């Protein structure tokens, strides 16, 4: 970095035909001897002296360091895109593949990734490697302080929604849980704004799928269709129809367990099967076709 800034200073100063002595002026803010050390790379300038150098050159201090340095390489976002955007549907071979990809991502970019990206990878690693609430650590064990802050937040971030997803994974199939806490974060998940961060909206869609699956296990269908509508709002705003088959399964299970309508339940199931087949997802279609056969339909 020492040479990167000193090279930019000397280049812009020489292209403006300004000499070192003329730039430093009387010497009240910078001397010629120091400017030589700054340009040649012997010394890294401070903020007050960098501000004076920018002012004399007609630039802002931002323009002298407008270099996009410490930028995350494109390969990370490409590997991160594969982790966020290709749903495993709890498939063992797809889960292990993403767990392998996380190990590769962490080895190559750990020294450069920000704290929030490292936190995203870590929560995603636990969500993928999750097996059962008895064999997997509770959310209050691996994310003690983090999950306590999430219990009080109103505006959820991406990592906050990821912690909520893992917390939903531990709630499933469990009895004697904190009921009032569960209803509270449901209200807050249904209150989040849907913007254009696909990573956020995909994770938000995951929490909505987990809430409905928990409501189905709890046999509590209050506000179930509200969770369905916000799930469709994520799909329609982001145009990520790769997740629409899961919504049709929810509407089918809603007709089967709340409306007691096996006709509409088998019809929404067929919509999910033809949607998964038109998406050409063998694991998804074979999973939905197994769910319909298990619920006593088709």
């Amino acid at each position: 970095l020492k040479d990167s800034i000193g090279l930019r200073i000397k280049t812009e100063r020489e292209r403006q035909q300004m000499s070192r002595e003329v730039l430093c002026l009387d010497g009240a803010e910078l001397t010629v001897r120091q400017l030589i050390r700054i340009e040649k790379g012997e010394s890294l300038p401070s903020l007050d002296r960098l501000s004076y150098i920018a002012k004399r050159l007609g630039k802002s201090m931002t323009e002298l360091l407008d270099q996009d340095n410490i930028t995350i390489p494109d390969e990370y976002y490409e590997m991160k895109n594969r982790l966020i955007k290709f749903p495993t549907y709890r498939n063992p071979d797809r889960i292990k593949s993403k767990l392998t990809l996380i190990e590769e991502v962490y080895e190559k970019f750990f020294d450069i990734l920000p704290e929030e990206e490292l936190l995203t990878l870590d929560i995603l690693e636990n969500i993928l490697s999750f097996t059962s609430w008895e064999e997997s650590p509770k959310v209050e064990e691996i994310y003690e302080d983090l999950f306590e802050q999430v219990k009080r937040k109103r505006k959820f971030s991406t990592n906050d929604l990821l912690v909520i997803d893992y917390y939903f994974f531990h709630l499933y199939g469990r009895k004697q849980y904190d009921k009032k806490l569960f209803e509270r974060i449901i209200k807050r998940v249904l209150n989040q704004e849907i913007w254009t961060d696909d990573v956020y909206n995909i994770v938000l869609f995951n929490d909505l799928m987990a809430i409905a699956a928990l409501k189905i296990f709890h046999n509590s269908f209050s506000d179930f269709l509200t969770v369905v509508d916000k799930a469709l709002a994520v799909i329609e705003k982001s145009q990520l129809y790769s997740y629409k088959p899961s919504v049709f399964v929810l509407k089918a299970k809603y007709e089967l367990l709340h409306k007691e309508n096996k006709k509409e339940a088998a019809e929404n199931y067929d919509k999910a099967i033809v949607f998964a087949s038109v998406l050409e997802d063998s694991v998804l279609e074979e999973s939905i076709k197994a769910g319909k056969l298990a619920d006593g339909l088709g």
Partner: peptide, 8 residues
């Protein structure tokens, strides 16, 4: 979670 909730 069931398969449909595993959208990650």
């Amino acid at each position: 979670l069931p398969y449909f909730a595993g959208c990650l």
